[PDB]
Amino acid sequence: MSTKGTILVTGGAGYIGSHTAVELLAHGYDVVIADNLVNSKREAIARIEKITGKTPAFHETDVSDERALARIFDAHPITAAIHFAALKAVGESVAKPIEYYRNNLDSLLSLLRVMRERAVKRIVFSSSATVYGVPERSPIDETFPLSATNPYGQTKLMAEQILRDVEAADPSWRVATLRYFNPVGAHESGLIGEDPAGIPNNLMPYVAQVAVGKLEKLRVFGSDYPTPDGTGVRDYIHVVDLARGHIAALDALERRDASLTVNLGTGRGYSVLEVVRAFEKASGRAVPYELVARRPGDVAECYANPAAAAETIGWKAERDLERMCADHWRWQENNPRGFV
Amino acid sequence: MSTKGTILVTGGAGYIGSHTAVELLAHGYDVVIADNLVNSKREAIARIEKITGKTPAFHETDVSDERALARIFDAHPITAAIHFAALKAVGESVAKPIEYYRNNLDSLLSLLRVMRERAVKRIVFSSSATVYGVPERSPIDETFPLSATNPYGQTKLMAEQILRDVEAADPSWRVATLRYFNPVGAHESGLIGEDPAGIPNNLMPYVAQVAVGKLEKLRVFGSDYPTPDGTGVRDYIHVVDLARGHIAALDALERRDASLTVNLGTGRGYSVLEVVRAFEKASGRAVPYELVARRPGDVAECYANPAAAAETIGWKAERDLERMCADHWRWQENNPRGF
Ligand SMILES: NC(=O)c1ccc[n+]([C@@H]2O[C@H](COP(=O)([O-])OP(=O)(O)OC[C@H]3O[C@@H](n4cnc5c(N)ncnc54)[C@H](O)[C@@H]3O)[C@@H](O)[C@H]2O)c1
Ligand SMILES: NC(=O)c1ccc[n+]([C@@H]2O[C@H](COP(=O)([O-])OP(=O)(O)OC[C@H]3O[C@@H](n4cnc5c(N)ncnc54)[C@H](O)[C@@H]3O)[C@@H](O)[C@H]2O)c1
Ligand SMILES: O=c1ccn([C@@H]2O[C@H](COP(=O)(O)OP(=O)(O)O[C@@H]3O[C@@H](CO)[C@H](O)[C@@H](O)[C@H]3O)[C@@H](O)[C@H]2O)c(=O)[nH]1
Ligand SMILES: O=c1ccn([C@@H]2O[C@H](COP(=O)(O)OP(=O)(O)O[C@@H]3O[C@H](CO)[C@@H](O)[C@@H](O)[C@H]3O)[C@@H](O)[C@H]2O)c(=O)[nH]1
C-alpha cells in the first residue's frame, strides 16, 4: 500500500473527480472512490484503470449515509478526503432547491462527522466561482465579497461556512477550499472526459456535441452584454490543470500546517464566440450557432485572479484554450455516445 | 375538524412551541405536535391539554426523519406548519457545529420536502435577532444587514435563505419568517413555562432560580458596556405575546397572499440590572449578583423596531416587563420539579 496517502475521493466517478483520481494514482497515492452514480456511470471507473493501469477502490455509496460511509473507512486506511460529491445543475437547483440543499449539505456533513470520528482531519473541498455572486469586476480575487444568485451557489457558500465552523471547534482540521472557475477539456488519452446526461447545460459539452453531430445547433445566450462581442466571458480552465491543483493543495496543507482557500482558474477570460471559433479550429468541424436571449442569472463576465494559488500552493494553469478544445474534442470524437 | 386550520407545530413540546400550541387551540385551530423531546418532556403535552381542555395530536418524532414525518401527514389534514424544532444553545453550537447544522437544517429540509409532496404550502418559521449579528444601532429593523457570530445563528440565516429559495421554486409558497428577540414569561395559569435542564444559559430562568433559592447568586456578564449601567440591554418579550404573533402571522399570510418577514419584539430594551430589579418587585424576593467578566459573543445592546409587525401583521406586544416577571415567577414557584 502507498506510503504517500490513501485518498477518499467522493464523487470520484464524475468529471473532475475522475481526472483527479487519475492524477492521484499517477503520483503514487492510493485512491478510494465513493460515488452513488447519480450523475455518472460505472464505466468511468473502468476507464480510470485503463489510463493508470491501477485499480482504485470503488464503492457505489451515497456519502450522506453515515453508516454506509463509515463502512468505507472500516475497509481503508484513509488519510485525507477530496469532496467532489454534489449536484451541480444551476437550473435544476432553482427548480429543486430542497434536494440540492439536502444532497449537497448532508453529503458534506456526513463526511465531516465520519472523518471526525475516525481522526482523519485533511480535506479538500470543491467550491465554485459561483460564491462570488455578481462580481463587481474581474479579475476576482479570494477576498471579494461572497454571495450567490441560485441555490446551487448557496450550497457552496454554506459549505464553506460549515467548514470554517468545524475548524473553529476543532483547530486540528486542515481544509483546502478550491474555487474552480469553468473546467473544460479531458485527459489527453481521450479515455475520460465529461459525459453529461441528456442535453448539456454547459458550453463546451454542447459545442462538442454540435461538432460530433449529436446536436444540430448551439444557442448563444445573450449577444448584448458589456463585453467586446456582447457574449459572456468566462475563465475556462483545463480539467487536468484543475486535477493537478488538488495534488498541489494536499502538499500545501502538509507543508503549511494550515488551511487555505484559493481560486483555481487561468486568469484569462474568453467569450462564447471565441470559444466556438477555437473549437472549430481544433476540431475541424463546424459548430453552427444562433444568437438568442440572455439566460436568466448569467453574469456578463467572470474570471479569476490566479495570484493566490501561485503563491500559496505553487500552482498555475498550463494548458491554453486551444488545448482545452483539442482535448475535449478527442474525448467526444472517440466516445461519441460517452461512456459505453 | 377545525374550520380554522390543522396546524403542525414542530418542536411543540418546547418553550415557545407549547405556548403557541395553547394559543392555537384556544383560538379554535386543531393542532398536531411533533417533538422528539430532546429538550423537553412529555409532561408538557399533558399541561397543554389541561390549560386548554383540548387534545392536540402528539407524535414523538424526529422531524428530520422524512419517512416518520410523512406518516404524520398521512394521519392528519395539515393546512400549515409552524417550525420551532431546533437546537438553540449558542455555546454548544460553537463546540458542536456539525450537530447543530445537521439538526437545524435537516429538520427544516425534511419538513419542506414532505410539505411539497403533500402540497401544503404555508409555513411559519422561528428565526432570531441573532441574524442581525452585531447591530450598528437599535431599534433594529428588518432591512439591517444580516450576519451571525456562531453556528446556531448561521443555521437561522441558512434557514431564511432556504425558505426564500423554496418560494422561488414554487411561488405559491407563503412563508412568515419571525425574528424573535428575547422571550420570557409563561402562560398566566402557571401550568407551563420555561424549563431549562441544568443551570440556565439565559437571564430570566437564572434570575427566577436565584429568587426561589435554587441557585445562590446571579452572575452578571460584563459591567463595562457603553450602556447606562454598563450591563447588556435587550428586548424582552412575553412568550404569550410571541405566541399570539404566530396566529397574527398565519392570518396575514392569507390576507396579503404574500410571504412576510418581521421582528417580534416590544421596541423597548432593558438592562441586566433592570430585569433583576423588576423580578424582585414581582416576586417579593431578593436576587443577589456578582459583576463578572463579559461573555464572549455578547452584544452591548439589541432591541427591535416593532413597526413592521404592527403594520404587516397587525400585532403589538401588550405585556410589560412587570407582567413577564410575575408570570415567570408563578411558573417557577408552582413547578419546582419543572415538568
Ligand atoms: N464542472 C464545473 O463547472 C464545476 C465548477 C465549479 C465547481 N464544481 C464542483 O466540482 C465538483 C465536481 O463537479 P463535476 O463537474 O465533476 O460534476 P459531476 O456531476 O460530474 O461530479 C459529481 C459526482 O458526485 C456524485 N454525487 C453527487 N451526490 C452524491 C452523493 N450524495 N454521494 C455520492 N456521490 C454523489 C455524482 O454521481 C457525480 O459522479 C462538484 O462539487 C461541483 O459542484 C464544478
Ligand atoms: N430566546 C429564545 O428562546 C429564542 C429566540 C429566538 C428564536 N428562538 C427559536 O425558537 C424556537 C423554539 O425555541 P424554544 O425556546 O422554545 O426552545 P426549546 O428547546 O424549548 O424548543 C425547541 C423544541 O424543538 C424540539 N426539537 C429539536 N430538534 C427536533 C427535531 N429534530 N425533531 C423534533 N423536535 C425537535 C426540542 O425537543 C424542543 O422541545 C427555536 O427554533 C429557537 O431557535 C428561540
Ligand atoms: O448552451 C450554452 C451554454 C452556455 N452558454 C454561455 O457560455 C458561458 C458559459 O456558461 P456555462 O458553461 O453554462 O458555465 P457558467 O454559466 O459560467 O457557469 C456554470 O454555472 C455556474 C453557477 O452560476 C457554475 O458554478 C459553473 O460550474 C458552471 O457550470 C455563459 O456565458 C453562457 O451564457 C451559451 O451561450 N450556450
Ligand atoms: O447568567 C446570566 C445570563 C445572561 N446575562 C446577561 O443578560 C442578557 C440576556 O442574556 P440571555 O438571556 O443569554 O440572552 P442573549 O444572550 O441576549 O440571547 C439569547 O441567546 C442567544 C444569544 O446568546 C440569542 O440568539 C437568543 O437565542 C437568546 O435566547 C445578556 O446581556 C447577558 O450578558 C447575565 O448577566 N447573566
Give, for A59, the enclosing helix (H) or strand (E): strand A57-59
CA angle B90, B95, B100 (to 5 degrees): 60
Residues A123/A164, Cβ–Cβ less than 8 Å: no
Q: How far apart are CA B81 and CA A106, in angstroms?
A: 23
* Interchain proximity A169–B109, CB inside 8 Å: no
ω into B139 cis (within 30 of 0): yes
Cβ neighbors of A130 (< 8 A, separation 6 or more) are A90, A148, A149, A150, A152, A153, A156
Cβ neighbors of A172 (< 8 A, separation 6 or more) are A121
Give, for A145, the enclosing helix (H) or strand (E): none
What are phi and psi for residue B252, nearest 5 degrees? Answer: -65, -30
Going by the DSSP 8-state scheme, the letter that residue B320 receives in this structure is -
Residue among A90, A234, A95 nearest A154 (CA)? A90
> Residue A79 to residues A83, A165, A254: CA-CA distances in angstroms?
13, 21, 12
A151 sits in the region (left: phi over 0; alpha: psi -120 to 50; else beta) called alpha
Distance from CA of B297 to the nearest CA of A (A): 14
Active site residue A152: yes
Cβ neighbors of A232 (< 8 A, separation 6 or more) are A221, A222, A225, A271, A272, A298, A299, A300, A301
Burial of B26 (0-12, 13-18, 19+ CB in 10 A): middle
Q: How far apart are CA A259 and CA A61, in angstroms?
A: 28
C-alpha torsion sign, points B123, A89, B117, B83: negative
Beta bridge partners of B124: B82, B176
Report the amino acid identity of residue A237: I
Q: How many Cα atoms occupy the beta-carbon half-sphere of B5 within 13 Å?
A: 20
DSSP B36-66: --SSS-THHHHHHHHHHS---EEE---TT-H
Beta bridge partners of B202: none
Q: For residue B200, give the ligand nearest its CA.
A: 4
Report the amino acid identity of residue A236: Y
Cβ neighbors of A5 (< 8 A, separation 6 or more) are A29, A30, A79, A80, A250
Beta bridge partners of B126: B178
Q: How far is the CA of B338 from the centre of ligand 4 (A)?
A: 21
Do the bridges between strand A233-234 and strand A270-271 make them parallel or antiparallel, or are there none, so unpaired? antiparallel
Please give the grid coordinates belonging to residue A277: 471559433
Q: How many Cα atoms occupy the beta-carbon half-sphere of A340 within 13 Å?
A: 8
CB < 8 Å to B109, chain A: 98, 101-102
Give, for B30, the enclosing helix (H) or strand (E): strand B30-34
Residue among B245, B208, B250, B239 nearest B6 (CA)? B250
Q: How far apart are CA A208 and CA B150, in angstroms?
A: 46
Q: How far apart are CA B148 and CA B127, in angstroms?
A: 12
Cell numbers 463587481 label which residue? A136
DSSP B155-205: HHHHHHHHHHHHHHH-TT-EEEEEEE-EEE---TTSSS----SSS-SSHHH
Residues in chain B that come right before a backbone break, where C and next N are over 2.5 Å apart: none
C-alpha torsion sign, points B164, B166, B172, B177: negative
Q: How far apart are CA A140 and CA A235, in angstroms?
A: 11
> Residue B23 to residues A275, A296, B20, B35, B319: CA-CA distances in angstroms?
62, 44, 5, 18, 15
Task: Please report the atom of ligand 2 found closest to the CA of residue B103.
Answer: 31
Residues in chain B: 339
The closest CB to that of B165, out of A113, A151, A161, belongs to A151
Report the amino acid identity of residue B302: C
Task: Please report the atom of ligand 2 found closest to the CA of residue B18.
Answer: 16
* Interchain proximity A154–B166, CB inside 8 Å: no
SS (H, E, C) B250-298: HHHHHHCCCCEEEEECCCCCEEHHHHHHHHHHHHCCCCCEEEECCCCCC
What are phi and psi for residue B275, nearest 5 degrees? Answer: -60, -50
Cell numbers 486506511 label which residue? A77
Residues A10/A35, Cβ–Cβ less than 8 Å: yes
Please give the grid coordinates belonging to residue B325: 416577571
Residues A17/A82, Cβ–Cβ less than 8 Å: yes
CB < 8 Å to A170, chain B: none
The CB density around residue B257, as the number of other CB atoms within 10 Å, is 9
SS (H, E, C) A231-296: CCEECEEEHHHHHHHHHHHHHHHHHHCCCEEEEECCCCCEEHHHHHHHHHHHHCCCCCEEEECCCC
**Catalytic site positions of B:** 152
Pocket test for ligand 1, best of A20, A41, A84 (most atoms within 8 A of CB): A84
Q: How far apart are CA A185 and CA A205, in angstroms?
A: 9
B10 sits in the region (left: phi over 0; alpha: psi -120 to 50; else beta) called beta
B250 sits in the region (left: phi over 0; alpha: psi -120 to 50; else beta) called alpha
Residues A186/A327, Cβ–Cβ less than 8 Å: yes
Distance from CA of A104 to the nearest CA of B (A): 12
Helices (H) and strands (E) in chain B, counts: 11, 14
Q: How far apart are CA A10 and CA A61, in angstroms?
A: 9
The closest CB to that of A109, out of B101, B154, B161, belongs to B101
The CB density around residue B172, as the number of other CB atoms within 10 Å, is 9
Residues A307/A317, Cβ–Cβ less than 8 Å: no
Q: How far apart are CA B304 and CA B137, in angstroms?
A: 10
Do the bridges between strand B270-271 and strand B233-234 make them parallel or antiparallel, or are there none, so unpaired? antiparallel
Distance from CA of A160 to the nearest CA of B (A): 12
Q: How far apart are CA A211 and CA A218, in angstroms?
A: 10
Report the amino acid identity of residue B264: L
Residue nearest atom 13 in ligand 3 by C-alpha distance? A202
The CB density around residue B9, as the number of other CB atoms within 10 Å, is 30
Largest CA distance in chain B: 56
Pocket test for ligand 3, best of A182, A204, A273 (most atoms within 8 A of CB): A182
Please give the grid coordinates belonging to residue B182: 428575547
Q: How far apart are CA B229 and CA B224, in angstroms?
A: 8
* Interchain proximity B165–A158, CB inside 8 Å: no
Q: Which domains does chain B have, with CATH numbers?
A: 5-184+235-265 (3.40.50.720), 185-234+266-339 (3.90.25.10)
Q: How far apart are CA B78 and CA B163, in angstroms?
A: 19
* Interchain proximity B168–A97, CB inside 8 Å: yes
CB < 8 Å to A165, chain B: 94, 97, 101, 151, 154
Q: How far apart are CA B201 and CA B89, in angstroms?
A: 8
Cβ neighbors of B217 (< 8 A, separation 6 or more) are B210, B288, B289, B290
Going by the DSSP 8-state scheme, the letter that residue B140 receives in this structure is B
Catalytic residue among A100, A152, A180, A270: A152
What are phi and psi for residue A173, nearest 5 degrees? Answer: -55, 135
Residues A163/A126, Cβ–Cβ less than 8 Å: no
Going by the DSSP 8-state scheme, the letter that residue A304 receives in this structure is B
Please give the grid coordinates belonging to residue B284: 417579593
Instruction: With both helix axes pointing from N to C terminus, report the angle between B272-283 and B321-334 in degrees, rounded to the nearest 10.
Output: 60
Mark the binding-site residues of B for UDP-alpha-D-glucose, compressed into ranges. Answer: 128, 182, 202-203, 219, 221, 234, 295, 298
Instruction: Tell me how the structure was determined.
Output: X-ray
